[PDB]
Symmetry: C3
Amino acid sequence: LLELDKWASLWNWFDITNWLWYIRIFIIIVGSLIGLRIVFAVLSLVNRVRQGYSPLSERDRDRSIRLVNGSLALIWDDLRSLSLFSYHRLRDLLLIVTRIVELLGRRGWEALKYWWNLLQYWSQELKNSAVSLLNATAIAVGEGTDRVIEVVQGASRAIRHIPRRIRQGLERILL
Amino acid sequence: LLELDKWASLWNWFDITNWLWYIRIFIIIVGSLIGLRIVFAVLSLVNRVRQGYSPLSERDRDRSIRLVNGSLALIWDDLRSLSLFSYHRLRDLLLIVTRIVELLGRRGWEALKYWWNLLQYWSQELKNSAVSLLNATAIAVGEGTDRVIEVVQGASRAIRHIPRRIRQGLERILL
Amino acid sequence: LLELDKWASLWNWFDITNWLWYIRIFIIIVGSLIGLRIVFAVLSLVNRVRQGYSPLSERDRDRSIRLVNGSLALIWDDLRSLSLFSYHRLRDLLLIVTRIVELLGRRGWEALKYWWNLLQYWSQELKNSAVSLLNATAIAVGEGTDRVIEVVQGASRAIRHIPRRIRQGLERILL
């Protein structure tokens, strides 16, 4: 079972054996390929020129070939970004990066403002559909029971419809 | 063939073994890395901004940094896309998404429309190269070949392609 | 140390072993998973309109569904690049590729050009940092530390400037 007997018998599949023993080599390239894909993001820019910014629904090839030559241009877009229109700035510029992240931690709360309001309107639509069927089916009974289904539904969503400024209050208490 | 003592022999390689029994676990992590790439698609947007306009041929680092601001923005793009117009749309979105495909699928056949055209012109381009060369070598024998060479080649392409509206006749005749 | 008896015992653990003996297959599936990922690059095109102009910080979602129709449209962006509207170009398309690369290949070397000036100023920022800090600390002492430090540092680095434009000599002398 297994061992030299299983491994040795495989040497007859010389072609496949190569893949079986050299796969480990291949795994590294596969992991590398996702990283290579990061460079592929530039390719979408090429796709934009070829297909147009709007959905996929001519001249681009001649210029697109310039992408090969893009190696020369490629130092131009990136070169001015790190040091900007001034020198001595290059060492100082990396520190700027910390500045936006510190400032953004304060305004980042916009996550919660929309999520509470967003879930709030969806719930309202659920109640509206239910109000239609519930109001209509309640009449079969009588005694104005349908009026009861409307008030209860309207009471819970409506009261929760307009809450307090949790983003503002929490923004000042968090920083 | 493999070996038993080789497995134990690797223990004497100081720490080479560390690569084998760690990279293997590391592979599962790589699988996670691919699912990481979907967010990278937003990076391509930043790239077109940082790339000027055309394929590959400064301040954009600070603005691209604004990509971090995408957290607050993220509820906004999803919010108008998910329901879009009015507000009874969120449940409707499941209906309209399915329903649009049927309406849109009808015009989608235009794929074939151009493909019919691809074969149509290349056929014509073949005639120009072939007729020119064959027309010239044909006369080398005498006088009378020029009519058969031009009439036979031009005749086959000429009668094989003339009617238009391929999808119009094809898509409707299927009823 | 090891033995086929140790491996066989693991067969009674019919659960995890599948991963252990199918991970080789798993990376291949992952490879396919990542190639599939490339289509996401078009999503960025949609992101511009659907997700806003700049990075992450309209109605076209209806158009996002038209992406299905993108098969119809997809021949329009591509068909014009190989053959172009001029036509007769299609056989030319294979030849032109050599001409544009041959033509652009001569001036394409300017990549090296930017690197020479680019690195040149970077050396200059480092030079200013050392002189300012070292001279300023040396000023604490009298005698004449200020004159020697600023003159010798600035004299050696500044005078070391030598214009050896490779591109210049490559354009005029390579003919």
